[PDB]
PDB file of C-alpha atoms (C1' of nucleotides) in Angstrom:
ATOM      1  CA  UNK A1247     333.070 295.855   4.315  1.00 48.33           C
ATOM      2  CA  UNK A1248     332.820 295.174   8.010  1.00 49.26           C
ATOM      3  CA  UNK A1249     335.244 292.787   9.058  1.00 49.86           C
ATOM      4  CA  UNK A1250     335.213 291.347  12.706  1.00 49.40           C
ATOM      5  CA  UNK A1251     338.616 293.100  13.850  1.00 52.84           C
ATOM      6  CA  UNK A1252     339.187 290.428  16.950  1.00 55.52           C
ATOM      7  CA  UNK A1253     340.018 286.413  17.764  1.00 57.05           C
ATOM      8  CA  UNK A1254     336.888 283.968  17.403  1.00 55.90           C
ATOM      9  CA  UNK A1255     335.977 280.969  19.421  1.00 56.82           C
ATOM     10  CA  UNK A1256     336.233 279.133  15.745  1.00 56.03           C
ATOM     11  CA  UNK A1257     334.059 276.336  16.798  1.00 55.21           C
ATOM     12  CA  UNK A1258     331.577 276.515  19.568  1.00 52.13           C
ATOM     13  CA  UNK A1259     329.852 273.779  21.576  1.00 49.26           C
ATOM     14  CA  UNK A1260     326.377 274.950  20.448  1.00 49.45           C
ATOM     15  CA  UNK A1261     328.047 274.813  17.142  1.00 46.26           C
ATOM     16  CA  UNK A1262     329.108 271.132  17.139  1.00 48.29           C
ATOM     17  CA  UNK A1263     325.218 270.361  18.816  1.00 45.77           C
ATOM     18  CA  UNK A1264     323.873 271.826  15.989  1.00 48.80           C
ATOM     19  CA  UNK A1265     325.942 269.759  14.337  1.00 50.86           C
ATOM     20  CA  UNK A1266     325.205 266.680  15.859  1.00 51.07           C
ATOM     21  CA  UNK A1267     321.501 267.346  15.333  1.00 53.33           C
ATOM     22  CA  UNK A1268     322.335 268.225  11.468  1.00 52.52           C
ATOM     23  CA  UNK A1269     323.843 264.592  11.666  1.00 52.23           C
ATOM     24  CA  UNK A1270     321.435 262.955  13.275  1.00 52.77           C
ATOM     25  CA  UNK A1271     317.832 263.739  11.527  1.00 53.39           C
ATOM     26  CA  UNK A1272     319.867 263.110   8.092  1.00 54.82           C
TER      27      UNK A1272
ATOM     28  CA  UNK B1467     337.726 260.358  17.768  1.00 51.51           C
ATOM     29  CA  UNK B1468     334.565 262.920  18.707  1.00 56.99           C
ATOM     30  CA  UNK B1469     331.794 261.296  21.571  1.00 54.04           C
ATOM     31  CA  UNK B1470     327.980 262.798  20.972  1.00 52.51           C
ATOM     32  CA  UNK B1471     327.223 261.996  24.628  1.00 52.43           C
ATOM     33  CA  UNK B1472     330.063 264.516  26.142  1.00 51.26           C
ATOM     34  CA  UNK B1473     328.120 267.195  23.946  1.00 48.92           C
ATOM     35  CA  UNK B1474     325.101 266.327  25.629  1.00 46.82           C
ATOM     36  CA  UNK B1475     326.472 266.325  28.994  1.00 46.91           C
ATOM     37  CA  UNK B1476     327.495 269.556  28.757  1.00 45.91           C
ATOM     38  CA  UNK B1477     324.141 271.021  27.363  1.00 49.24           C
ATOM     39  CA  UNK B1478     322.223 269.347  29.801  1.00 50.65           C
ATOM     40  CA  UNK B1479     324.703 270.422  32.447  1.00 50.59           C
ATOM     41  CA  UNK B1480     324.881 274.431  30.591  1.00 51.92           C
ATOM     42  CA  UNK B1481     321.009 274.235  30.973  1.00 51.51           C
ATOM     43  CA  UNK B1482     321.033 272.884  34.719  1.00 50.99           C
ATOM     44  CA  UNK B1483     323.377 275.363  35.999  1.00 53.45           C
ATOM     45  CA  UNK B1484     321.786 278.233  34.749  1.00 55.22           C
ATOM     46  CA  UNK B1485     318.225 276.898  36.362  1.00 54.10           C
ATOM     47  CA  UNK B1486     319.516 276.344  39.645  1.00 54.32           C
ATOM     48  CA  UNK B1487     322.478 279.012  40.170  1.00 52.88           C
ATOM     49  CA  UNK B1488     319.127 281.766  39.303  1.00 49.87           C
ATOM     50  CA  UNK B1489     316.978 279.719  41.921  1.00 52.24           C
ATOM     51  CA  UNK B1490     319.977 280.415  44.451  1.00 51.91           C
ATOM     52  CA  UNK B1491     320.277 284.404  43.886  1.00 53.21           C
ATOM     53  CA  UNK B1492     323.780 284.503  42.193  1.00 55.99           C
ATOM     54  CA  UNK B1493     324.161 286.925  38.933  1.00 57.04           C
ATOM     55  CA  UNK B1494     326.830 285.638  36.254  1.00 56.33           C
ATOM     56  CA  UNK B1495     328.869 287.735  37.859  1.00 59.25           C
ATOM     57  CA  UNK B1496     328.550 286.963  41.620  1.00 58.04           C
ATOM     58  CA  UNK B1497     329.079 283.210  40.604  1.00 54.79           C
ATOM     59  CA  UNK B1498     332.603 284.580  38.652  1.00 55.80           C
ATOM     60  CA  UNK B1499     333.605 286.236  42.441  1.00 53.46           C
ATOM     61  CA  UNK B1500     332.382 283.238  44.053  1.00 52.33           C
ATOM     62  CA  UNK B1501     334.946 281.231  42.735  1.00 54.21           C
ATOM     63  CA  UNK B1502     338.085 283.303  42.811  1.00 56.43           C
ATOM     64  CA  UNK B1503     337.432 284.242  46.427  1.00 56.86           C
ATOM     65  CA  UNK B1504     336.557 281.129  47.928  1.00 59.93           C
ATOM     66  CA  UNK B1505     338.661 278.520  44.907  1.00 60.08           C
ATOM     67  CA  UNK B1506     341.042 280.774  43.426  1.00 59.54           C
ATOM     68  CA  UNK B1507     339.414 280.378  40.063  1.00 62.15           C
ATOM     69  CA  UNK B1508     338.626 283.628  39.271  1.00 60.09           C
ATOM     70  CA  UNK B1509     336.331 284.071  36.234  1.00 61.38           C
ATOM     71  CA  UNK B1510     334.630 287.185  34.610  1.00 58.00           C
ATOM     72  CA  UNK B1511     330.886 287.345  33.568  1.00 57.11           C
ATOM     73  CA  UNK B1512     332.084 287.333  30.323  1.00 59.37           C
ATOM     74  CA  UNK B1513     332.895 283.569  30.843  1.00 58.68           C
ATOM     75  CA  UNK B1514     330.121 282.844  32.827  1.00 57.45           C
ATOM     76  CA  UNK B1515     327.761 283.880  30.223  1.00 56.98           C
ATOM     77  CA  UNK B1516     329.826 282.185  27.465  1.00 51.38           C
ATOM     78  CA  UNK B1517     329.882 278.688  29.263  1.00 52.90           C
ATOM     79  CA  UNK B1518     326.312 278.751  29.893  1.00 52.62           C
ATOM     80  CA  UNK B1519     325.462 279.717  26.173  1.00 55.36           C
ATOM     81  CA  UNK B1520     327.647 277.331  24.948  1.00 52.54           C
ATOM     82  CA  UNK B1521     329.500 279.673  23.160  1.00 54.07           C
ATOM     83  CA  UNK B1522     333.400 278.323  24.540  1.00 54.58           C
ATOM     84  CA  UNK B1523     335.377 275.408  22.488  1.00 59.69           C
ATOM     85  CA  UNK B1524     334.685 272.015  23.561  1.00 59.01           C
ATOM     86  CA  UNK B1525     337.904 271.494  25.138  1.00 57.08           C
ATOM     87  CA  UNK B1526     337.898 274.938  27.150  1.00 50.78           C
ATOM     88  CA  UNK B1527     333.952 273.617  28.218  1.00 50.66           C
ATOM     89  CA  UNK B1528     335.049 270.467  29.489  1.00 48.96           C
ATOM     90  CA  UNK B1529     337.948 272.266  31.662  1.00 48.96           C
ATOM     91  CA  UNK B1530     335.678 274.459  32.819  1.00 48.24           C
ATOM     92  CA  UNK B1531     332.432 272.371  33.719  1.00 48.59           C
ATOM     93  CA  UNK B1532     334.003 270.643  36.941  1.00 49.04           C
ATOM     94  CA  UNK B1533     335.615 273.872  38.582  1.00 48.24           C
ATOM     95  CA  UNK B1534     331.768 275.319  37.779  1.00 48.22           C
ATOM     96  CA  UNK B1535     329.894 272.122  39.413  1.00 51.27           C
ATOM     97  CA  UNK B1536     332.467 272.349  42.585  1.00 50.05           C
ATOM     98  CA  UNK B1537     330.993 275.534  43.231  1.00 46.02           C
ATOM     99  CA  UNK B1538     327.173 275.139  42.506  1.00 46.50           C
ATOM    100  CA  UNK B1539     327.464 271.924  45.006  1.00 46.80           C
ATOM    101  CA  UNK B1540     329.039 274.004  47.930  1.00 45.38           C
ATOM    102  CA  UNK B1541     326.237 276.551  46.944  1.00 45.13           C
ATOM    103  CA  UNK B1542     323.731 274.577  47.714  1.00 43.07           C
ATOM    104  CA  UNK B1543     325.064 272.347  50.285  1.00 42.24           C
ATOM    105  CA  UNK B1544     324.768 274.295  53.276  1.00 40.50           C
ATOM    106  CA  UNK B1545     323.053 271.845  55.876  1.00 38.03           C
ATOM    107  CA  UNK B1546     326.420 271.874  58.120  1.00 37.52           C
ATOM    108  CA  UNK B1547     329.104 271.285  55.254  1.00 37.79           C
ATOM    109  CA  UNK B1548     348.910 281.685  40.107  1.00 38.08           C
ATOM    110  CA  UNK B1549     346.710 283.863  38.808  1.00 37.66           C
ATOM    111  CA  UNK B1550     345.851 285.157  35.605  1.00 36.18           C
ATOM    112  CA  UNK B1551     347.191 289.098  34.878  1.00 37.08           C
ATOM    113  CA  UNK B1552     344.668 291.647  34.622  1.00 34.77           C
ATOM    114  CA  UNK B1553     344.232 292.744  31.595  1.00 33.08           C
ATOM    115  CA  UNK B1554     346.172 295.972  30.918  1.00 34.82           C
ATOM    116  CA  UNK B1555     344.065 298.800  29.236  1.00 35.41           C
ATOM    117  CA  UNK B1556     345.370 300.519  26.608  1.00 33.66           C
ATOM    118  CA  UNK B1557     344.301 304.303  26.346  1.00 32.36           C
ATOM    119  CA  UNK B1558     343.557 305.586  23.098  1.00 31.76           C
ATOM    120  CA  UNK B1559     346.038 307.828  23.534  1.00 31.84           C
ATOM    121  CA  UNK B1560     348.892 305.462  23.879  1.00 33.97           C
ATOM    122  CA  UNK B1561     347.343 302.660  21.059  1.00 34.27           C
ATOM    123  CA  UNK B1562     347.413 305.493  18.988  1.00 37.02           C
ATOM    124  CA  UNK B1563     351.028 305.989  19.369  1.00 37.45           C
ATOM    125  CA  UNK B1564     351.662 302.431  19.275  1.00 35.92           C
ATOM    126  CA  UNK B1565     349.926 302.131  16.017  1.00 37.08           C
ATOM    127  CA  UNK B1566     351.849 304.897  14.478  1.00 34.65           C
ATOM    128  CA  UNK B1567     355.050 302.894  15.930  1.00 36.46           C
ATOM    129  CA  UNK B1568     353.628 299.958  13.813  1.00 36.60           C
ATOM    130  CA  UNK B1569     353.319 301.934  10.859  1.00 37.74           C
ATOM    131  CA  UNK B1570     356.527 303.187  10.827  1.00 36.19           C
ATOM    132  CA  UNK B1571     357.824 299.406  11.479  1.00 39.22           C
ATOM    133  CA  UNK B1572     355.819 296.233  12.374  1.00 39.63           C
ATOM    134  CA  UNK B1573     358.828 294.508  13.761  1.00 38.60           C
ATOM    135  CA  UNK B1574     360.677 296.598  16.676  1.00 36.88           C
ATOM    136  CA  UNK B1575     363.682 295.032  17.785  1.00 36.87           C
ATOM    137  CA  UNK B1576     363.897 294.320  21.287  1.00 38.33           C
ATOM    138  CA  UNK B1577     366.170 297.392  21.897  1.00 36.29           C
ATOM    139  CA  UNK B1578     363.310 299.256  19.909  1.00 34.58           C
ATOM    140  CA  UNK B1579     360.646 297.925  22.120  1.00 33.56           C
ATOM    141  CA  UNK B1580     362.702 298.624  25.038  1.00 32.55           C
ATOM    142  CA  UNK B1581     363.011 302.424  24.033  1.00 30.62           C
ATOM    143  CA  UNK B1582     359.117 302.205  23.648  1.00 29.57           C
ATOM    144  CA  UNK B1583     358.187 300.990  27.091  1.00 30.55           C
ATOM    145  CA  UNK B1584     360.624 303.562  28.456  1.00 31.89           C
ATOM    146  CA  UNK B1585     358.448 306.297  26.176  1.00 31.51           C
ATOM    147  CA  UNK B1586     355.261 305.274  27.186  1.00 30.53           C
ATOM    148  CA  UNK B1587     355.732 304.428  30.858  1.00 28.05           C
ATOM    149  CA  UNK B1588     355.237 300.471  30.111  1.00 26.47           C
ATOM    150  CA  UNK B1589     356.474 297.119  30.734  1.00 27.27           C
ATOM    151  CA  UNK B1590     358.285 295.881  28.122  1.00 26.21           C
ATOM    152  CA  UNK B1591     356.456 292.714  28.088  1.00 27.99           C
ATOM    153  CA  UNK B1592     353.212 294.647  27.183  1.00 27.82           C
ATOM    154  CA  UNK B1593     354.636 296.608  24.531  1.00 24.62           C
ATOM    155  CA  UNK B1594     356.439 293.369  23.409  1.00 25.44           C
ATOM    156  CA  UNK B1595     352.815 291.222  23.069  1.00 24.85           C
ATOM    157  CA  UNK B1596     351.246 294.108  22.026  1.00 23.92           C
ATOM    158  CA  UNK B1597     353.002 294.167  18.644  1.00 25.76           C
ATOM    159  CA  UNK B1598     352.978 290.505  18.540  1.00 27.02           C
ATOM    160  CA  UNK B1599     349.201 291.160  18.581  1.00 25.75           C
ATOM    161  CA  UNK B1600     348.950 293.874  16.286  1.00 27.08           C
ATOM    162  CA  UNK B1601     350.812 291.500  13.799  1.00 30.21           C
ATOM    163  CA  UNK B1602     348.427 288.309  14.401  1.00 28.60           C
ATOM    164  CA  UNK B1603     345.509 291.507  13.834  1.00 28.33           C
ATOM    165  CA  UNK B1604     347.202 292.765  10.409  1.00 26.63           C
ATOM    166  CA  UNK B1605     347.097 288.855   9.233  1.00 27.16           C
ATOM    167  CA  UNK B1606     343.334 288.260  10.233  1.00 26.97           C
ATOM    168  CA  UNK B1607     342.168 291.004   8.870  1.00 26.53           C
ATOM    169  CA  UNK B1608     343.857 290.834   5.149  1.00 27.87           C
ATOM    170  CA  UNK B1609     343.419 287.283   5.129  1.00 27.91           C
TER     171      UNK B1609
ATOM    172  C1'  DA C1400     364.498 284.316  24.289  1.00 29.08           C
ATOM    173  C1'  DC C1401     361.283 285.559  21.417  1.00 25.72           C
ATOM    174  C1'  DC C1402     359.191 284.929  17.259  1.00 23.43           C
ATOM    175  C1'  DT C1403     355.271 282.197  15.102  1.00 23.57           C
ATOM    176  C1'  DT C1404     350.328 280.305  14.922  1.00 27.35           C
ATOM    177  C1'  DA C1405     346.624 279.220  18.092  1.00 24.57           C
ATOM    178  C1'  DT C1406     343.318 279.955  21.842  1.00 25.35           C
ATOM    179  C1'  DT C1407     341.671 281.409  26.277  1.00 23.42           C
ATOM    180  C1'  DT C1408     339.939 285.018  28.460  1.00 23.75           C
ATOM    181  C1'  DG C1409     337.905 290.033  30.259  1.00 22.38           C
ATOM    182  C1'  DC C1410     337.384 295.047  29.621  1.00 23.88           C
ATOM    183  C1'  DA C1411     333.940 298.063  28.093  1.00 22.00           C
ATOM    184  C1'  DT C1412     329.647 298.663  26.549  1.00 24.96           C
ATOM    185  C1'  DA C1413     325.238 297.804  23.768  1.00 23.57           C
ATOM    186  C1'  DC C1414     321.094 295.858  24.292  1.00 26.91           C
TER     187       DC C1414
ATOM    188  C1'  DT D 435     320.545 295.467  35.620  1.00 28.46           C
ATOM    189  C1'  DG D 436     322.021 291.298  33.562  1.00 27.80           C
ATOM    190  C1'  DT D 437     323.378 289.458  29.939  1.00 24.53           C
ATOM    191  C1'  DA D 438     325.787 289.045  25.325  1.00 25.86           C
ATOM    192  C1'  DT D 439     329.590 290.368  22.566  1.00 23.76           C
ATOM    193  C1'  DG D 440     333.206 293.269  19.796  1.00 25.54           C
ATOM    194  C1'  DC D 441     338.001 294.088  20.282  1.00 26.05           C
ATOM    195  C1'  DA D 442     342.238 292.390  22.015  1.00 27.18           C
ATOM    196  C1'  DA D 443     345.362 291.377  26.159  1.00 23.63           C
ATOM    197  C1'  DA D 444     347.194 287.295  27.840  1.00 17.40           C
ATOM    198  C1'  DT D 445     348.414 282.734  27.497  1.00 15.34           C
ATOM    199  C1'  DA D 446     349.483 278.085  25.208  1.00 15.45           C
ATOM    200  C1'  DA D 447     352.510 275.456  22.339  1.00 19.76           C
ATOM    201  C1'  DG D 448     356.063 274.888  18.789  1.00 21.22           C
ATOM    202  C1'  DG D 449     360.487 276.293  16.480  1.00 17.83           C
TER     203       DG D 449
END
DNA sequence: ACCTTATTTGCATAC
DNA sequence: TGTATGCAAATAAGG
């Protein structure tokens, strides 16, 4: 198992736009 | 209390800046000088290529954005118009020795981390975040 | 002061 | 060569 051994940006801004457009053509 | 049209401001803006800091000649990396010698802000690449992929948080994008238009506008307005630490590198040699430290004990005192810095040649503030670290890392990665 | 959890931020390097 | 990114140093914020 590979696990990522540094910090994350948890949530992104292309992320949340993504998001938004998961939100939107619901 | 989230707003859509802040997200889209800073796509549109991401997407803009990219288009016209490549139409005025300046890597990722010359924009990241740019702004430390001439603002103070210095910023790596690595920053520069995060903000204009999107890939920061939406709080450290919005912090970001004006400090990155100040610059593009100065840029291309030329008709007559403290500090971050470095970050310290760690040899393999020494994070070696540091790691068997942390085997031995995770938790140095501060006398113990004194006698380490002393060892190794360091500032005790390094040595002192660098087990802080190496804690946060043992948590993340045995989640 | 100095730990914790949390997050920004840049070496170093792979494409 | 520039760009993207893994690992983590440095900082932020609370106790």
């Amino acid at each position: 198992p590979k696990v990522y051994q540094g910090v994350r940006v948890k949530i992104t801004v292309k992320e949340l736009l993504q998001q938004r457009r998961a939100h939107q053509a619901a | 209390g989230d707003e859509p049209s802040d997200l889209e401001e800073l796509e549109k803006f991401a997407k803009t800046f990219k288009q016209r800091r490549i139409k005025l000649g300046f890597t990722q990396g010359d924009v990241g000088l740019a702004m430390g010698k001439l603002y103070g802000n210095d910023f790596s690449q690595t920053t520069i290529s995060r903000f204009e992929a999107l890939n920061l948080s939406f709080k450290n994008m919005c912090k970001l954005k004006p400090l990155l238009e100040k610059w593009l506008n100065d840029a291309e307005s030329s008709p007559s118009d403290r500090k971050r630490k470095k970050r310290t590198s760690i040899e393999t040699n020494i994070r070696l020795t540091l790691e068997k430290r942390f085997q031995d004990n995770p938790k140095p005192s501060s006398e113990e981390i004194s006698m380490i810095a002393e060892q190794l040649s360091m500032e005790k503030e390094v040595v002192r975040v660098w087990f802080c670290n190496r804690r946060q890392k043992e948590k993340r990665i045995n989640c």
